[PDB]
Amino acid sequence: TNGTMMQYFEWHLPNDGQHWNRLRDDASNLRNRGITAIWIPPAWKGTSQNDVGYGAYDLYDLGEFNQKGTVRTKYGTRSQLESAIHALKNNGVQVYGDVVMNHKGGADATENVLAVEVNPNNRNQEISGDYTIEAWTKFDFPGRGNTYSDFKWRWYHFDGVDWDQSRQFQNRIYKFRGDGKAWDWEVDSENGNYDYLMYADVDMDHPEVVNELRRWGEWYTNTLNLDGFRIDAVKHIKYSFTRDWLTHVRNATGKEMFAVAEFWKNDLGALENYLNKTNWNHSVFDVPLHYNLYNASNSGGNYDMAKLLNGTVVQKHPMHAVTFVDNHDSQPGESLESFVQEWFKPLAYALILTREQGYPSVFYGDYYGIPTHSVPAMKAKIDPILEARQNFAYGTQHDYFDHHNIIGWTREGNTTHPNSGLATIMSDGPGGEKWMYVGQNKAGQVWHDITGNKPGTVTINADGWANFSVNGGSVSIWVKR
Ligand SMILES: [Ca+2]
Ligand SMILES: [Ca+2]
Ligand SMILES: [Ca+2]
Ligand code: NA
């Protein structure tokens, strides 16, 4: 089959400890609809039970220990997680674990640390003398003791923080002083140096940090029997660290470990740099495409659809692109809000799912909805497109990004997938038609719109061509009836 990944969470999931169960109970159905890989939410203990997991407190506490006021994570207990992972494995579905190494939050205790303030707008600029702050840097994990790992985090494992417990000033970032202390590099250059993001920033220059994060990497992989990784916040983590951490873990575990990194920047040049700097050893989410999609969805039909793939990872480097419509960062109300409007969402999914380029990701928030923000489940509309991908989107592709409203592509199908072959056609504006070539061996085949957006049929002519149609603001995916 074609590989399809799913982000199986959104920001505003209920804190009911029942998410690992939902996943478990969804494993079969998801595999049957062609989902071949699940990126699971952060599996470890956050700063609290309701933390989505990115407030990463204890990477070794997978809802196992009584820490931060809870045993389970937001999603459930460790044993629930294993049952769900097992459900996925029995179905041949891959498990991609989230990976949050940029920072740690929810420290157990503070330390007095000699620090320097930096300009939040340019973290390269030191804007104060040295002075001592009270910094949240001591991680002893008292609920876990030394089970799994005896490693204790101290100030010297971090580069800096955004809070002085003794003074409690807002809007400050503190770089730690000491021999060898500097924001890491290379990282994104926004704000001069974007090493600092939040909480206690991990010092990727510290040998103990490197050694520890590498071994946790193995432990995490071995423990949960992960198949790959979704890597969090990679523009704020020393690029060479990520590259080598990944190689370390693949070396140590003997596993392929597919990885996709969240390098969130609407900037192909920047993503390319990151890919070069990480030796092309893993994929990045196609953030530029996400923005193209969002922009398109906001343009009232005025977007030039022929340019929808322009400036994107999937157009230039599709083998290193994971394509996605939305994620928890872009969802309504979140830090990077840029949610693809509902009318356009099917077209976006048809784009990522029915083309041969890139490794498409389905957003839980899109699929099952975001009830907190009145975003409907769009499973009813996505399902036909996943069926297209699963059973029809095979063989030679023919692109027709040749109109500013009406674009489409066909797939000739192949012999391994019987009756495979499709013609996707979408319009961000008024509907219409387009002659597309689906293969001459398809001659006289009667085709219909698997989305049911367009009623009726289209019959492949003798040349292997048909005039496929689409409604306005819509997508049709024609397949053999
Ligand atoms: Ca550093
Ligand atoms: Ca960092
Ligand atoms: Ca248009
Ligand atoms: Na750092």
UniProtKB/Swiss-Prot annotation:
Positions that bind Ca(2+) 2: 159, 182, 184, 203, 205
Cofactor note: Binds 2 calcium ions per subunit. Binds 1 sodium ion per subunit.
UniProtKB keywords: Carbohydrate metabolism, Glycosidase, Hydrolase, Metal-binding, Secreted, Signal
Binding site for Na(+): 159, 184, 195, 201
Pfam families listed in its UniProt record: Alpha-amy_C_pro (PF09154), Alpha-amylase (PF00128)
Swiss-Prot/TrEMBL site (Transition state stabilizer) positions: 329
Protein name as annotated: Glucan 1,4-alpha-maltohexaosidase
The protein's required cofactors: Ca(2+); Na(+)
Pathway(s) per entry: Glycan degradation; starch degradation
Species per Swiss-Prot/TrEMBL record: Bacillus sp. (strain 707)
